[PDB]
Each structure stands twice: as C-alpha cells, then as structure tokens.
Amino acid sequence: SLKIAKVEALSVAMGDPTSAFVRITAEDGTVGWGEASPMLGGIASLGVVARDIAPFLEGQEVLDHAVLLDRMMHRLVKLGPEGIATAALAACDIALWDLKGKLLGQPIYKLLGGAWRTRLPCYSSIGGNAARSVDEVVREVARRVEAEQPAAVKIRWDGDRTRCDVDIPGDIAKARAVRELLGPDAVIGFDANNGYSVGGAIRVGRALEDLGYSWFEEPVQHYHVGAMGEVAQRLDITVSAGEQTYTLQALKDLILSGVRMVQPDIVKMGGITGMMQCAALAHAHGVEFVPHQTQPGVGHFANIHVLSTLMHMTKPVELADRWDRGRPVFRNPAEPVDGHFALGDAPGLGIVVDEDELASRATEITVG
Amino acid sequence: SLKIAKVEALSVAMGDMPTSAFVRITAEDGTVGWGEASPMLGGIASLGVVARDIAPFLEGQEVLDHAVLLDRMMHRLVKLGPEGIATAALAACDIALWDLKGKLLGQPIYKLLGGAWRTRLPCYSSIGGNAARSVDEVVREVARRVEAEQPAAVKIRWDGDRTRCDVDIPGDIAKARAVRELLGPDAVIGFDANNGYSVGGAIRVGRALEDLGYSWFEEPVQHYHVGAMGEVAQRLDITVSAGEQTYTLQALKDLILSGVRMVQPDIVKMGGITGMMQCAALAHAHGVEFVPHQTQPGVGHFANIHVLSTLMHMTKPVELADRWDRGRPVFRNPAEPVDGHFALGDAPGLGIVVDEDELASRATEITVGRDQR
Amino acid sequence: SLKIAKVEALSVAMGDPTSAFVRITAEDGTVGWGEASPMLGGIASLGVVARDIAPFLEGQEVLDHAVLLDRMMHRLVKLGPEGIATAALAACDIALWDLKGKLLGQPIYKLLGGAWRTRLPCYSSIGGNAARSVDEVVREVARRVEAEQPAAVKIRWDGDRTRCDVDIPGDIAKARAVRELLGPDAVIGFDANNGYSVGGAIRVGRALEDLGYSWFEEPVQHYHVGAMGEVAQRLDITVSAGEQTYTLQALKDLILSGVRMVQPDIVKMGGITGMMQCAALAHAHGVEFVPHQTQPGVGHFANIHVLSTLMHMTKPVELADRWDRGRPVFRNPAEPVDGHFALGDAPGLGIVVDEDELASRATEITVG
Amino acid sequence: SLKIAKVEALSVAMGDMPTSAFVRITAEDGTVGWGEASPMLGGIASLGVVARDIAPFLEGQEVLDHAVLLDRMMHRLVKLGPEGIATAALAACDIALWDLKGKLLGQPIYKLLGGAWRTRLPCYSSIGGNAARSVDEVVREVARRVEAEQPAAVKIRWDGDRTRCDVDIPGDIAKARAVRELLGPDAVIGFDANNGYSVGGAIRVGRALEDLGYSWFEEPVQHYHVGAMGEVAQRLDITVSAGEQTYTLQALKDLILSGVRMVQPDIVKMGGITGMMQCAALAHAHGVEFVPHQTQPGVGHFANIHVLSTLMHMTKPVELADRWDRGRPVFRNPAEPVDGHFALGDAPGLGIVVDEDELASRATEITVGRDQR
Ligand SMILES: [Cl-]
Ligand SMILES: [Cl-]
Ligand SMILES: [Cl-]
Ligand SMILES: [Cl-]
Ligand SMILES: [Cl-]
Ligand SMILES: [Cl-]
Ligand SMILES: [Cl-]
Ligand SMILES: [Cl-]
Ligand SMILES: [Cl-]
Ligand SMILES: [Cl-]
Ligand SMILES: [Mg+2]
Ligand SMILES: [Mg+2]
C-alpha cells in the first residue's frame, strides 16, 4: 500500500509573520499538509521534523500514522516532549491525515465518523488589549464584530508574563466598556493570558460575573495547574485552560485539578488523532471541549474537521487576529460567512495551496 | 456515498452459550457488514432493540456517518439504561458499520485505525466453571486447554452463583495452588472470582494469590460496588481488574477513579470498535492497563483483535474463552490459536468469513413484533 | 400458601401513548398489577418479563417476593441491569405487593408500617418547555395551576440531549416569566432534563437563585455523576437527580458525589421493596427523597403508598403531563382534589382496572 | 561591571552519547564560562534555541544579572514547552553564567552558594543497558565497574524500549537477584526501570526488590503518569524515585504532591545551578530526598557536584554513569573517582579545564540558519 516518499519542513512568510508547515509527499505524488504552532516561528519544531522525524517516516506506510507517530513520540520523549516536539508530531499527524483522506477519497470528518454540523459558528478572538486604551479596545471589537458577525466575542490581553496583576481596575473597565458596546445578550469571553495571581484572578472573575461574561480563559500562570483548577472551582464564571497543555496525561491532570472547559490546540499537540483522544477524555469527565486555534490555514481546517464531529459543542470556533494572512499562500483559508465557517467535502483537509505563492515564500528547513 | 439498505437482527444457534446475537447490515450496493451483541440470556433483548429502535433509524443513512448516527441513537435510547441491553445493541451496530466501512474503503479495520503494532497477538486460555469442579477436575481441564492452545497465560474463572458470597475460600485457594503446581513457577496465571467475594474475602483470597505469584485478580467483589472494587485494588499488591460489567465511558472513568488499574470493557457489551478506542484513550490518559473481556469466537473476537493490534502498551494477552469450537460451522475462520497466537490477516473490514447456508439454517430473525423461524 | 399461577406482560394503549403493565394472577384467581417505565413503550422490559422472569415466577409463593426477585436480579445482572431489566423487576415487585395486600386484606401502606399522611400534596410537573415560546410556557403553567391547585410547580425542558447549552438566556427568561405569573411566594422547581454543561448549569442555577426557585433538577447529563454532585455542592439552590439512577449502589454513589435530593422512580427500579430501601439510604445520609413519577395509574398508586410512609416529606408528589390518559383503562387514576391526592384503604394498591377497556387496548407480549 | 560579549552553541564529538551540547559564553574581558545542555538526540534543538532565541538577548547584558535575564528568557520561551529542549537551553546558559561569575569574583561556585558540607563526594556506579543483556552479562559489567570505581552504591538501569511494557518481569528479577548475589548482603543497590512497567508490574517488581533489600526503585512507570508514579511510591516500601524527566519547579511540586519522596531533576535538563538550588529548597520544604540525575562526565558533572557539596542531608551518592571515559580528550579533568569519591577543588567558577585544540577540532557551531563545520 501507499508509502511516504518525502517529508519537508517549511518556514513560510504569510500575508501582504511566519508559519511552520509540513508537506508530506506519497510515492504516487499525492501531497498532505500539516502545521506546527509557529512559536518564535516554529523553527525549532521544523528542525525536529527535518532531523528526527522525517528520516523515520520516509518509506513507511501512510495509513500507519498512529503507530509511526506514537513510536516517534517515544523516541522524542526526552525532548520534553511538550511544546516543540508535540507540535512537530502534530504537524506530521495532520499531514498524514490529509494524505489519508486523499488516498481514501473522503473528507477527514467522514473518516472520523461523520459531522453533526458542517456550518460551524465562529467567535471573534481579539488580542493585544493589555496595551490598548479603553477606546481602542472598543474600536477594535466594534470593527471585528461588524466584519465577522460572530456568535461570541473573546477579548484577550497578551500582556508580559514576567508581570502580574498589572492593572486590574483598567482590565475591568475594558471588560465593562466591551459589555456596553455589545449589549446585554452578547456572549463575551475574557482571556487573561496568564496575567493574574490567584487572588487577582478571583477579583477579576467576580467583576466578569457582574458583567455576565461567559468564560474566563487562562487566569493564572499555566504552570500552576493546582491554582488553575482552584480558581475554576472557586468562581462561577467558567474558567478555561489547556492551550499550554501538550499531552493527554497533562490534560487529565488539568481536569482533575478542577478545570471544566479545556482548550488544547491541534497544531500544538496531538494533531487530528490526539485531539480526538482529548475529546474522548473530556467526554469521559463531563468537561467542555473548546480548542485553542489561532492559525487561518492548515490548522484551521484540521480544527474544523475535528469540531464537526463534536456532539456537545458549547462554544464557537476560534477566529483570531489577522486571519487575512491566510492569503495569498492559501486559496481558501478561514473566512467567515454569516458568522459561520462552511466545511466542505473535498478529500483530506480540503485546503488549497497556491503553488507559486508558497514557493516564493517558503524556506526549507533541512538537516544542518 | 454508500447508504445503508437493511439492518437485520439474528439469533443464531452455534456449534453442536448455545446461541449468539448478530447484526447483519447490508448496504445499497449489496455489501454486508457483521456485528455482534453480547449474548446474555441469548442477547434477545438487545436484538429486539436493534430491530425496533435502531434499524428504522439507520436504514437510508450513510455508512461513514457511524459515530454521529450511533451517538444520536445512544441519546434516543438513554432511558433504556442504557447499560447492558442497549449498549450491546449499539456495539453490534458499530462493529457492523466498521466492517462495511473497511469493505467500502478496501482496508482492514486496523489500517483504518492508524496501524497495527503487531499482527500476531498472544492468547491466554480463559477457563471457566471452576466453582463447581473438584480440584482434580480443575487441574485436568487446565492441562487439556494448555496442551491444545499453548497460551502465553492462563486464567481460571469461577462462574459461581452471585446470590452466594464467600462460599468456599479454602477450596478456592486449594484450586489456585494446584493450578500453580501444574503450570510451574514461571507461568503467568490470573484468577477470575466472577464477583464471588466480600471485601474481606477478596483481601484474604488476594493475599493467597500473591503467595502463589498470580498475576491478576479479576472481579473480586460484586460489580455494583465500585468503591469497594477500587478499595480492594488499592489494598492489594496483585493487580485487581474489573470493567467487564462496565458499559459507558463515564462509568469506566468512575471505575478508574475508584482505584482500579486494569480495566476490561467488552467490545460486544458496549462501544464497539469506536467506543473501545475511546476507552483505550481514557486508560492511556490515566495510566491504567487495558485488557478487554471477550468470550465470543467469531465477530466479537475479530473486532477485539483489530482494536488490540493498535494498542501500544499491550500488557496481557488476548482472551480465549471456553468452547471456542462453537465458532464453527457458522464461521469459516473463527478464533483458533496457532503457536499460541492469533494471526490477524489483511482482508478488508473485519476479515471474518461467514458460511451463508449454515447461518441461514441456524438463524432466527428478530423482527418488530416477533421471532421468525 | 398462595402460589403464582400466571404472569402476563401487557402493552396497553392509553387515553382517548402506550404503557407497560404486568398482571400477575394467583392460584386463587386474585390479581396484582405492576408497571414498568414505558420508555419507547416499555416493550423491551415487557419482553424481559415474558421471556426471563415469568417462567421462574410461575408456581412460586406470592409472599416470597424479595427472595424471588433478588434471585432474578442476579440472573439478569448481565442485561445491565439498569433501565430495561430494573423496570421489568420493578413491575413484578409492584404486582406481587398488590397481590400480597389482597391476600392479607390490607392496603400496602399499612403493611409498610403505617402512613404519616393519607392526603398528599401534589406538584404540577409541566414538560416540553424547550420548544415553547415564553407566552406558551406561561399559558400552559397558568392552565394547569388553575385546574390542579398544586402545592408547587415544576417546569421541565425535555430538550434534545445531543445538544447542550442551547438557549440559556431564553431559558432564564421563561423561568422569570413563570415567577412573575405565580407570584413571589410560589414554590417553583426547574427541570433541565440534562440540558447544560457544568458552567452552563452554574449560570442557570445562579439565575434561578435570583428568582427564588426551590430546586434544580438534572442540570447536567446524568452519566456525569461527579459533575452532578459538583454542581450540587457549588450552588445554593437544591440540585436534584436520581430519575436515571437504577440501583441502590448507584444511588449511594450519587449521594456521595454531593447530591442532597434524590429522585429514583418506582417503575424504573426497585418497585415498592426497592424504593423503601432507597428511602432508608436517603435517611441514613440526610438527603431529601422526592421520587420521580410520571404515570397516572399503577405507578402513581405504588408511589403514593410509599410516600405516605415517608416521615420527612419535603416536596409534593409529582403530577406530570397528560395525566388524564389514566382513563379509561383505570377507573380511579391520579386526579387531584383541593391540590391533594387522597390515598384510600382498599387491599393492595387499591387501583381499579376497567376490564373491557383494558382488553380492548391490550397487546400481550409473549415469548417470540 | 562585566558584560557578556558572545554566546556560542557547540555540538561536540566526544571521546573515541557520541556527541554533547555545550554553551560557551565569553565576557567583554575575554574570560569564558562553560555550560551544558542534556544531549538528547545530540541536544541540537536546544543548541538551536540558544543560538536563535537566547544568545541575541544575552549579548551586551551583565553576567551578574543571570537570574533576571534567564527568567525573562523562560517567559519569552514559554510557548516552546518549555519542558525539555527549552529548559535544557536555559540550564546550559545558567551554568555558563555561573562559571563566568565565579571567575569574575575569584571564587569556586560552592563558596558563592554559601559553602560546602563536603568536598569529597561519594559516587554510585550507574550501569545502563541491562534490558538487552543476559544475566551473566549484567553480572560481568557490574563487577567490572565496581572493581574500577569502588562505589558507595550501584544502580542497574534497564534502558529498554518505551513502546513496550512489562516485557520480562521474571528475567528482570533474576538479574536483580544475581546482582545482589555478586555484591553481597550489605551493598547499597538501586534499580532503574527507565519507565518499563505498568502500575501492577511496578508493584510486582518492587516487592521482589524489597525481598532483595534494594535501596531505591527509579522511574518504575511512564513519566507522564504522575499520579501513578506517586501511587506506586506510596504503595511500596522501597523508595520510589522520579524527577529526571521533570523540567519545572512547579512540575517538581506536583511530583512531590503525588507521593514521590525522592526526586532527581537533572542540572543540564532544567534549571542549571540557580534552578537546582530552588529545587533543593522545595525538596527540603517537603521532606523529600534530593538525588539529582546526571549522566555527563564534564560540565554537567561539575555543576552537579558544586550544588551537591551544598546539600546538608545528602542521602545517596553522586551519579557516575556509563562511558565516563568520553570526558577525555575534550576536558582535561572530567569525572574520575578516587577511592570511590569525587574530589571537588577550589578553582574559581566550575573549575573544569577544557582542551581548546581538541574542542576546536571536534566542535560544530550551531548558528542562526545552519551548522558550521
Ligand atoms: Cl478511517
Ligand atoms: Cl499550583
Ligand atoms: Cl494550559
Ligand atoms: Cl462500593
Ligand atoms: Cl465491572
Ligand atoms: Cl463526572
Ligand atoms: Cl440520575
Ligand atoms: Cl553569590
Ligand atoms: Cl497518572
Ligand atoms: Cl520524571
Ligand atoms: Mg504536569
Ligand atoms: Mg456508576
């Protein structure tokens, strides 16, 4: 059966920022695309693909993705494997799923057992609010809501994680102004990006409850798993975490700590195969499954195939800043219509890459 | 794409326990998938749920949509328990849809599940009915099965009356001792109490099994006492296992949280292939062993080995239970170990081969409002 | 002493919906009536009675109900036994108690040690509110309150359990409108029928607390026992569950999880014998005992005999939708007067079946 | 005061495992500090993170500001995990800055850390690769290392394939037994499973090791199962240890809370000198033993012994792992026990002596965008 011929790690300049892609070519010339979270460009993950994963995958069977990549996980375990190595593995998983869908003539979600929905609501995820004035926060939220007509809005802080409890009153004032803009009905989330102490998180949480916010993402430093779950159990507003959780077992620990809404990211860990396992874990424990996803191309497509299979979808699909950067490398990147993403039925992921644009923007990451 | 044309629920006389419960799903192109429900009291109630509740919903739907279709059905059927009867009905349909899917896509199920770590799977001889036997009878039957099967491990099961408790602890220990003496000091041996002990009785037997070097201790207390099951697991050194009478992913989670570190749900009792893969993921998330219960020689065995071929950290062998000969004549290639292993082939779907005419002669269709045959 | 001659499993068309009854005839021609929860008609439970239970009971002594049926439970354990098998057993238990009361010339509650009350307050249990507009919810509650003069009102959602957190603001608006209708004093319960995530349940719970609601039934999926009890401990409003709990041990687990008001159903599990054990368990743990019961005939009578024996009755007896369907099969089905049920002293259950109506509406479920 | 001029990331061919990962930091006055990253798959990814991410930030900054500089970098690098690759990169830079600091201030690192309890540190012979050996081969290699090193303790490590589980428990116990027989009843012996067992398998091996009087039992289950690791630690009597695959102070806290009472983080995998001192404090706060993992004969060894010289309640010896001979010729004074001890000298900084020309001939610089050599 179908063998892997070539595995390429590609650093790609996006928009008119760099992303990190894996292109896997089968012996029949078919191609699958994967993506690794582009943290500091994703260069370290791309190096791990090129040096450590690619030589093993070449000549192996496309359909054996789970055995191949779980063997690789164990080979790479002493690289963490959190972060760099899990993202490298996730990218390879997504690419092998893309190839698999093409080989079998099916969209990935059909191979995953079917979709509950092929029109998926979005939420506008608006970052960089720590640095903005109140008027600037309101201006940007208004702009994106007008353009995207989302089912929900999330305002994210993206502050400096060496600092803590920097401007709680200002943060609350911004949350209040956003509530006044969007009206009493609006579904609004607040993402602290790890900005608070336990006590600071409680204080902000109570203010967000007074403002009717729906969820409160990453209130404390992600490394404090006990504190994350404690804050989750102490508050009424739904506390969420998981975007910086990179293994199934650490996700289990996060749930056991008290967190009831988890948000692992398909290009940071797991890929399609791992994210389905994470969904199963969440269903076993009665926790909401609301993936983190900020990339407009390959990662977005992997995310929506997985989310189309989720029975109890409780929050919309993330649409983060500067999603326009999906063009021109991709012909059909994330682009909401009537506040939804329309998942199609092309084989594999169904993402379409512009060959000439990619070539002009791509740097291959090779062994030394 | 490929639509479901017909769903049949079949009660089938097997071999020379005497009847099994199968689901045959026929697609619009005439291809057929086979599933199996645990044949508890014949599996007749499960077959009735298939015929009345599930079949009318699946007919006309897409084969590939199995997860959405069957999770929708689970929610329609939730007030039937759904533990036991309904989960086995759902499991049978899942297995049949996977068989159809493999045939549609031209791949064995393990390839579709992401690859096999192994296609030769070690077996263990699972030998039941020891409560009723004398010591010499236990030894004789174990020796017989071991000679025939060359297994990687042996499990002796009690299958006593569950209205009784702590019936004959000294005799049970004597049987365990005699089996150790037969098999030698190296042999991997498990003991399945089939829910026969109190917590105190279970501790007492557990310590005796530890002295005899037994490897695992299955279902020591009544399955309904989940707290007690996990307590006994944490109090003993020998690995306590349970899960064969656990029917949902959430109840499996509860069993793990109680303290159980080896879980044994059954692919024809709950979940089917799709659900068993989820259970495997849950076990991996929690660091517990995954050692499915499986006692049927045909469809259920094949589903079980496709799933187990995908398990990275396989720690115990595949179950081979009593009277596996009954796989024939309904099936042409039922479970039959070679050099102590099951050889998993590469035929599309399950790869199980049914003798159509034998099946026809032995099958009673369970229909809306009756039995036919 | 008195032997069982015949056990019949009967599917019966009700009103001018199908129910599931067990008729047991003793050797002297006396008859006892039982009922199994009519889930999808209760046909599977009726089949279990006919195939698995009836042949064992025939020729056995009526008075040996507990030994006979606990032996049957163990014979049937691998059928779950949750749901189908426990309902089949419950129906047989109720029928044997009816026969026992007739044989001994006593109403069942006297055999159970006496009644604290023979006039039992009701609550109007009004379902199908997920699908209604606010005005339709208010209209139906008003209609039933006018007719039934209940001691309390419960509004139930009965939504699609494949969906989650569908319309929290609308749900709260309906709860608010019902509070405004019934006034500040009114005792009102809200039954989510498993419609929320943990976080959604907390959000609705706080709104119900603001509206002075008395209890909050089945907020999360019943399978998430840990989450059910967590929600119960996190909120102030009394969270209740148990209607989808089918064994004494699983009821123990539900209590240990944190639930302080339990609602097992006499025709879903246990029958009279099992429900008395459940009441004992609740008393041991200091939890309220408020049975789920939605059937107007046999199940209602079994329920009120048991509830007449409950010392610390804290909530009224459930009176669910379309209770008029008790006629014409029964001559004296559930029918409140001055907001109460009047329990009489006829031997056994005291339910009166119209022979000709039953015969015209009954289909016997037989072995194949 | 003294500014950092240059940060170099070097992949170095060692001895005759074959390559190591070093960081050389040069101050504006020409003084040099040496650090090391755990050379997992050569440490190349860590070296790339040093070259691309850390080096440009450190160049021009004050040597003495190491903690603020590297904690700022940890936060810049947090989305790289930072477990494993990034923490080892940070550890290497910390060690190099401490070496520079000691040279600047004219003091050995242990003096700067508040004094040494001891400058002669007992060693233990850490002997790997026993999964693959026969019993006689295990005995032969242990006898060889013991004759050469005269250690205060011996640890036998398995280093098996982590995709496999409970592979050969009887054989493992036989090897442990043979080693006890070789070394005598008094000998302090540890057993390192390298993550080879299930919870049940770990309990079974643990009891056998207790019967053989073993002193500690390292990494019995997969490291990712933190709950299971601590559970096994609390269930057994033999001291269960872990931490070598734990990379943050908070994850070390979680490992302790799970039940582990002997922790073994590695100075070149995480923290460096600064972080290892914090880990020691955490262990002291919780009453757990602190017994670092360390397998490198040069820079990492020297960092390790400076820190361990400061540990009041030292309970186990310093690790001396396989092929320590590979310290030469790159280093002039790599780890080499004398009368079963390591002699810590008083040279400023680490006190490690590098052969410049050997280093040059064996070093490939890892730079932004490539390998050079
Ligand atoms: Cl597939
Ligand atoms: Cl914490
Ligand atoms: Cl996180
Ligand atoms: Cl229990
Ligand atoms: Cl079980
Ligand atoms: Cl739960
Ligand atoms: Cl319930
Ligand atoms: Cl100092
Ligand atoms: Cl764990
Ligand atoms: Cl570790
Ligand atoms: Mg952790
Ligand atoms: Mg349970």
From TrEMBL, chains B, D:
SMART domains this protein is in?
Answer: MR_MLE
- A GO BP term, please? carbohydrate catabolic process
Domain (Mandelate racemase/muconate lactonizing enzyme C-terminal): give its ranges.
136-239
GO MF terms, alphabetically ordered: hydro-lyase activity; magnesium ion binding
Keyword Repeat present in the record's keywords: the answer is no
| Keyword hit for Ribosomal protein | no
| Residues engaged in binding Ca(2+) 3 | 192, 218, 244
Q: What is this protein called?
A: Mandelate racemase/muconate lactonizing enzyme, C-terminal domain protein
InterPro entries associated with the record: Enolase-like_C_sf (IPR036849), Enolase-like_N (IPR029017), Enolase_C-like (IPR029065), Mandelate_racemase_C (IPR013342), Mandelate_racemase_N_dom (IPR013341), RHMD-like (IPR046945)
**Could you tell me which Pfam families the record lists for this protein?**
MR_MLE_C, MR_MLE_N
The record lists the membrane-crossing segments as none
Chain positions recorded as Ca(2+) 2 binding sites = 62
- Where, in this chain's numbering, is Ca(2+) 1 bound? 59
Q: Which cofactor does it need?
A: Mg(2+)
UniProt keyword terms in alphabetical order: Calcium, Magnesium, Metal-binding
> What domain of life is recorded for the organism?
Bacteria
Quote the record's binding site residues for Ca(2+) 4.
354, 356
- CDD domains hit by this protein: MR_like
